[PDB]
């Protein structure tokens, strides 16, 4: 059960952007350092970098006092945008080994660490303790490969993806700098995780699909409703200009579709007009708006339009998405391949072109399906001598039922659907164990 922060669940801006340009899609989850037009740090010259140690201890004390005053147990603290800052609380860094993951969390979303451990045979004293995460004892492996007895494997867990994580040490030269309009902030941090290839749990849509087009419509319907809740006029009213500024890629006619059922147009003698909320329309409450669009659905759409921009930059037009190799690496292709393979509908390519590492250290998420005369002329005696020659044990030579003998010698001269799935498991296990070895190694290259 994942409980996101309140600005994440409330679909708030700029945590959930409404529209992203071609520049923003290339810079998706890589925000460039941008100058301010006003404020303290819009000025030239050196700027003070302030410590946080008193602020961290004070906030941790206050949150503990709020826990003990009602009167203990588990308390939810991520209620405001101010609570989501990096200025307070215990922090990690997480470095994704994938350049562009199929699913990505936004600022404000939540994830868990589960410490997957397979018990040793006989008398297990228990899993080793870790600084982070909750221990989960598993008999069936949640990954593509199987855990070994006594093996502890840390992993990120949320509604988007599953991916193994590896605790490393932050280098002694590297610090975390928090930069705002008001000043520079610095905190010490030692714990950094290397995150492997994701096992996606939520489906990424294709471009201009019915699911994708429903998501854009619903997200527009969510954004319109919260504009009415922001309006202080009685009766409530909004402007077309505010929606078009947030949604420059929509035509006004598509916005006219979403506004006709809930609002009435009142024209005024100025090029700035209002949509007045219908008196007989009950505006939906906050948690009803929450059920319309989830944070996980936005990330699946965000992954699509960013990857669609990357394919257009690579020369692939919309008619390409019989299929090209790079189009197979798209997240709408990889996640549909993996989830169907997770549900037992098909198997995976694993050694193939959709390997994100490019050197054999990852998985390729591409669907593959789940798919005598002369021996009987041997005239028992020569078949007996042949079974003696191959090294067949003397019991089978001794019984010498001739049909059984010829079936055994055909089997030995052979030495198919149980081998097909076993070779899939062998290929999965090899790269899984190889990925465990490389990304956890402290070798200096």
């Amino acid at each position: 059960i994942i409980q996101h922060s309140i600005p994440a669940v409330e679909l708030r801006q700029p945590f959930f952007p409404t529209h992203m340009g071609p520049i923003k899609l290339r810079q998706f989850h890589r925000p460039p350092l941008k100058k301010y037009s006003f404020g303290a740090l819009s000025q030239p010259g050196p700027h003070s970098v302030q410590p946080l140690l008193k602020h961290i201890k004070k906030k941790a004390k206050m949150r503990e006092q709020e826990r003990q005053a009602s009167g203990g147990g588990e308390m939810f603290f991520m209620r405001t945008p101010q609570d989501l800052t990096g200025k307070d609380g215990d922090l990690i860094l997480a470095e994704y080994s994938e350049e562009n993951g199929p699913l990505m969390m936004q600022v404000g979303m939540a994830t868990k660490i589960k410490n997957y451990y397979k018990r040793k045979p006989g008398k297990d004293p228990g899993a080793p303790d870790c600084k982070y995460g909750e221990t989960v004892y598993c008999h069936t492996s949640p990954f593509l490969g199987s855990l070994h007895p006594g093996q502890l494997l840390q992993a990120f867990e949320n509604n988007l993806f599953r991916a193994p994580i590896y605790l490393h040490k932050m280098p002694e030269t590297d610090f975390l700098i928090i930069r705002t309009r008001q000043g520079y902030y610095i905190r010490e941090l030692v714990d950094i995780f290397v995150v492997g290839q994701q096992c996606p749990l939520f489906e990424v849509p294709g471009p201009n699909s019915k699911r994708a087009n429903t998501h854009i419509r619903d997200f527009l319907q969510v954004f319109i409703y919260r504009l009415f809740w922001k309006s202080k006029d009685r009766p409530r009213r909004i402007r077309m200009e505010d929606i078009k500024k947030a949604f420059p890629s929509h035509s006004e006619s598509s916005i006219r579709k979403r506004l006709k059922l809930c609002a009435d147009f009142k024209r005024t003698g100025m090029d700035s007009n209002w949509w007045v909320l219908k008196s007989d329309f009950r505006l939906p409450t906050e948690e009803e708006i929450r059920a319309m669009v989830s944070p996980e659905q936005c990330c699946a759409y965000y992954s699509m339009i960013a990857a669609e921009q990357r394919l257009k930059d690579a020369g692939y037009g919309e008619k390409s998405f019989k299929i090209d190799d790079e189009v197979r690496t798209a997240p709408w292709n990889t996640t549909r391949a993996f989830i169907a393979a997770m549900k037992g509908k098909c198997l995976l390519e694993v050694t193939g072109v959709a390997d994100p590492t490019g050197c054999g250290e990852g998985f390729s998420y591409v669907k593959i399906p789940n798919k005598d005369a002369d021996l009987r002329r041997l005239s028992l005696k020569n078949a007996k001598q042949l079974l003696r020659k191959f090294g067949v044990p003397e019991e089978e030579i001794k019984k010498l039922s001739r049909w059984e003998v010829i079936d055994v010698v055909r089997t030995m001269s052979t030495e198919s659907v149980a081998e097909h799935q076993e070779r899939y498991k062998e290929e999965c296990q090899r790269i899984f164990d190889l990925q465990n070895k490389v990304l956890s190694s402290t070798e200096v290259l």
Binding site: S70, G71, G73, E287, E288
Partner: protein
């Protein structure tokens, strides 16, 4: 936030002395340690009734004394406004003035000017009150067997049952809830008779060394005054061995009955501390069984005292649910009378809500999850039945302050600020709506978050308790509705205030006219169903919800709802399931195996309609499907709710023989117990419609044939069919439904009558180790369900024919069982209860004449509770049908005069349920003097208990309710 009550309290010491068995009196002194709040607190008020004070004292200074009783009659005894409304309003205002939650008076000691200057100096005082209870007429009980020479010593006991605010009736206090105090309790008791109250055994040797003993129970744990009760007399048994500290107190010659009874309690403690993540937050736990019960449930601090009717001694199978059911009730309401506490009567509903939900969670992981859902169906049946009888049961945060009413729920009585106006129907539905509002909190908030909430509540309770009495920082154990709502919103803030304003603050039962339409019957539109509702009188408009549709072989389709309920809605459509001879099972629900093209399967991809199968909304859903869909629901469905609602819907109209076949197929599997009870009732109702349509055999003989093989059973099933309780409940139920099988010539159940006679012949010895009692009782009930009203054509009532022919055989068998249970008696004379119900049914059919003298002789004092309650139900229905005014006069005089409260309770309850003298149908002339005597019995002679005049308020609800009685 804080209580609007001055004069905070810390300590109190009771000392019962000279407890008498002949003049039956109690003397004692009480000790209060008081921190007053404000100056000029002169008229300090305590409250009690039936307590003659000997002296009051504060630090060797006897101050003034005020003793009023406005809980008695109107200040003018002949107030001619003898109606419901004026008496209800005046009684509500008067007993609110009895309550000290204002400047009021019942026991106002006046502080003298010397002690007023002391209060001006120091607001710390002690209160020493010497007083005496008389022969207790509503505050205690002295159960004494009528021997009085020697067995009054060994055989009698002394206790106090009562309602929540019955601590007033026992020893003088405040409004007895919501005063966090601590107690020292001194008990002058006999050496054999053991006193049982709250607290701990802090000082007990052979005390005072003269002739008797004296017990010191100290309650250091801060609770309220409405948890103290003193059972004196029973015998000590530790039934410890699993948890080492569970103590029990019961009357002699009942002790191995406890040795079987108590166990499985440790499992309930383990599950409750899996819930709460604590220990049992006390030293020990006490339980007393007693042959009387004001309330069967009653649960106090570290102590449960209730009836000696729930022993269930290892052979009496049909109290396998009931015993630990009532133990779970007396542990849950215990736990929420201990620490978590209301600030007012309107703020209570959280408490019994979470208690009933906790023993519902106990009913989850102990026995019968499908029986748990059947219990939820019984909860909805109770709520829909009562709030279609009367108005809603509303859970107020809003007062009527400023002499205001604000009560649409005042169809009878006041409800906001006060307990002792309500009825037990209203109180039971208060608890039932508390159950289902907690299920709505399940439906919007996860169970793990509820565990977090409840752990937070008990963390604040245990932290705020067991300390040095932190001044001004101690009322955190008042965890009423507002702060509890704030704690829920701090854990998970959702639209739970709309849930309050729907179900907590708008008391309405919602029917559902969800009209089935059929699209994709090769139609343009695709799988659409209309939503509709309007049914006034008691209605409620509930909007955004979801709807569950099961396909032929497919997905659970869930569909939203809207307000403005003249609606049309869609389904997230199934595929076109065509070539269904090839599409045999495309994953209906897992690996279930079912194949029927017997339905209207030309163009029908739908099977069943459902709105919230987890039973969120207080609902009464009315719709129509094809009959094949209803009958295909009864071959298999994963909801006992769906099975018994299809059972009701197919009890209404149909009679094909395929219905009988599918019913018999459903009755021969492993599905559920009571589904087959109501399915045999389906067979009864449908074979009653087989008068001209007798296609099948005489039913349910082949069901006993094909299901029960003792030694292959050569045409008769006889012996030793137990240790499989499926067959136990089924053989208990089925001949009752067999006796209903009637086709109209003379209704002629003659083969069934002779077969039931042969079954009554063929009973078992001790090879069955299971005390064959209830099987006999329900077969006698089947004899009672052999109603033959049309024998006496002209005058055949009065020993003409020695009335004939099978009624005499039924009289022979009920005579045999009455005299056997007079000689054998096996477990409570339950056979005698069924026989008296049979004798009343025979009096209702004119065979045995309508004479109450047998029922009069079984409504006498020295019998069991069940015999007396059955004879009193019988004489209430006798006064209903026949015009016996004299037995009604005797019934009202016994309402006035008897020591047992529960028989008065149930006389008033089922006299309201089964009324004679019906309003605006007045042929037996209530106006003569019965209105006067009922007005007297409301005013006088009813200061014993609150609930007896509550039942009399229910009587004037039924009898001439919102008007003059047409006297003058």
């Amino acid at each position: 936030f804080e209580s609007p009550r001055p004069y905070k309290l810390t300590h109190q010491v009771v000392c019962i002395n000279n407890i008498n068995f002949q003049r039956k009196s109690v003397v004692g002194f009480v000790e209060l340690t008081i921190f007053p709040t404000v100056a000029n607190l002169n008229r300090i008020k305590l409250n009690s009734k039936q307590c003659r004070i000997y002296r009051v004292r504060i630090n060797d200074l006897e101050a003034a004394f005020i003793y009023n009783d406005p809980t008695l009659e109107v200040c003018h005894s002949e107030s001619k406004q003898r109606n419901l409304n004026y008496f209800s309003n005046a009684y509500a205002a008067a007993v609110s003035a009895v309550d000290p939650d204002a400047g009021n008076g019942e026991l106002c000691i006046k502080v003298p000017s010397e002690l007023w200057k002391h209060v001006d100096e120091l607001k710390v005082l002690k209160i020493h009150i010497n007083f005496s209870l008389d022969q207790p007429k509503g505050g205690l009980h002295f159960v004494v067997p009528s021997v009085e020479g020697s067995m009054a010593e060994r055989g009698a006991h002394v206790f106090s049952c009562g309602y929540q605010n019955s601590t007033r009736f026992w020893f003088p206090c405040v409004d007895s809830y919501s005063e966090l105090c601590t107690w020292k309790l001194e008990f002058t008791v006999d050496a054999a008779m053991v006193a049982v109250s709250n607290g701990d055994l802090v000082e007990t040797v052979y005390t005072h060394d003269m002739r008797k003993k004296t017990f010191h129970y100290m309650l250091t744990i801060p609770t309220a005054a409405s948890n103290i009760s003193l059972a004196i007399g029973p015998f000590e048994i530790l039934v410890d061995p699993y948890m080492h500290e569970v103590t029990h107190f019961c009357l002699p010659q009942l002790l191995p009955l406890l040795k079987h009874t108590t166990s499985y309690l440790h499992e309930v403690f383990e599950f409750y501390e899996e819930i709460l993540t604590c220990r049992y937050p006390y030293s020990c736990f006490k339980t007393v069984f007693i042959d009387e019960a004001y309330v069967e449930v009653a649960a106090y601090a570290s102590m449960s005292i209730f009836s000696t009717n729930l022993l269930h001694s290892a052979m009496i199978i049909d109290e396998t649910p009931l015993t630990r059911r009532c133990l779970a009730q007396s542990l849950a309401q215990q736990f929420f009378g201990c620490f978590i506490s209301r600030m007012s009567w309107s703020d209570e509903w959280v408490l019994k809500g979470i208690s009933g939900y906790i023993y519902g969670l106990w009913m989850k992981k102990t026995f019968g999850v499908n029986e748990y859902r059947h219990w939820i169906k019984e909860e909805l049946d109770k709520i829909v039945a009562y709030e279609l009888k009367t108005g809603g049961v509303l859970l107020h945060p809003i007062f009527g302050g400023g002499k205001e009413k604000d009560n649409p729920a005042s169809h009878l009585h006041f409800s906001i600020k006060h307990p002792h106006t309500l009825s037990w129907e209203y109180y039971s539905m208060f608890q039932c709506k508390a159950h289902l509002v907690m299920r709505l909190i399940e439906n919007r908030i996860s169970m793990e978050f509820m565990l977090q909430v409840f752990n937070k509540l008990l963390s604040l309770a245990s932290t705020a308790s067991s300390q040095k009495f932190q001044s001004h920082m101690w009322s955190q154990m008042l965890v009423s509705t507002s702060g509890f709502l704030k704690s829920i919103s701090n854990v998970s803030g959702k639209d739970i205030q709309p849930l309050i304003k729907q179900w907590v603050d708008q008391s309405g039962v919602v029917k559902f006219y969800g009209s089935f339409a059929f699209n994709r019957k090769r139609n343009v539109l695709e799988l659409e169903i209309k939503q509709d509702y309007t049914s006034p009188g008691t209605q409620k408009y509930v909007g955004p919800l979801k709807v569950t549709v099961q396909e032929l072989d497919g997905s659970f389709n869930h569909t939203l709802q809207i307000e403005e309920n003249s609606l049309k809605h869609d389904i997230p459509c199934h595929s076109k399931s065509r070539r269904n001879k090839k599409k045999k099972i495309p994953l209906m629900n897992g690996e279930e195996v079912d194949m029927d093209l017997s339905a209207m399967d030309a163009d029908s991809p739908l099977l069943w309609i459902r709105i919230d199968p987890d039973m969120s909304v207080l609902r009464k859903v009315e719709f129509e499907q094809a009959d094949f869909m209803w009958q295909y629901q009864l071959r298999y469905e994963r909801d006992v709710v769906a099975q018994q609602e299809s059972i009701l819907a197919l009890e209404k109209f149909p009679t094909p023989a395929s219905r009988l076949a599918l019913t018999d197929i459903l009755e021969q599997e492993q599905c559920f117990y009571r589904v087959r009870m109501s399915a045999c009732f389906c067979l009864a109702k449908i074979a009653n419609s087989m008068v001209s349509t007798w296609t099948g055999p005489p039913a349910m003989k082949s069901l006993f044939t094909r299901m029960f093989c003792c030694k292959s059973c050569p045409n008769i099933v006889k012996t030793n069919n137990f240790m499989s309780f499926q067959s136990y409940f089924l053989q208990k139920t089925m001949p009752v439904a067999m006796a209903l099988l009637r086709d109209v010539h003379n209704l002629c159940p003659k083969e069934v009558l002779t077969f039931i006679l042969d079954l009554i012949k063929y009973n078992d010895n001790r090879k069955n180790k299971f005390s064959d009692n209830y099987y006999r009782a329900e077969m006698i009930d089947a004899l009672a369900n052999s109603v033959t009203p049309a024998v006496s054509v002209n005058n055949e009532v009065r020993t003409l024919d020695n009335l004939n022919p099978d009624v005499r055989l039924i009289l022979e068998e009920i005579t045999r069982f009455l005299n056997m249970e007079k000689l054998l008696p096996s477990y409570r004379h339950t056979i005698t209860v069924s026989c008296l119900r049979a004798i009343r049914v025979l009096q209702k059919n004119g065979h045995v004449p309508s004479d109450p003298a047998l029922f009069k002789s079984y409504a006498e004092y020295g019998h069991f509770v069940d015999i007396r309650i059955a004879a009193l139900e019988a004489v209430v229905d006798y006064t209903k049908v026949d015009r016996s005014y004299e037995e009604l006069q005797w019934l009202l005089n016994m309402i006035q005069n008897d020591p047992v409260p529960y028989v008065r309770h149930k006389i008033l309850n089922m006299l309201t349920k089964n009324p004679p003298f019906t309003k605006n149908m007045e042929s037996p002339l209530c106006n003569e003097a019965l209105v006067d005597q009922l007005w007297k019995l409301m005013n006088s002679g009813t200061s014993h208990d609150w609930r007896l005049r509550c039942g009399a308020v229910d009587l004037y609800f039924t009898l001439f309710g919102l008007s003059r009685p047409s006297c003058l």
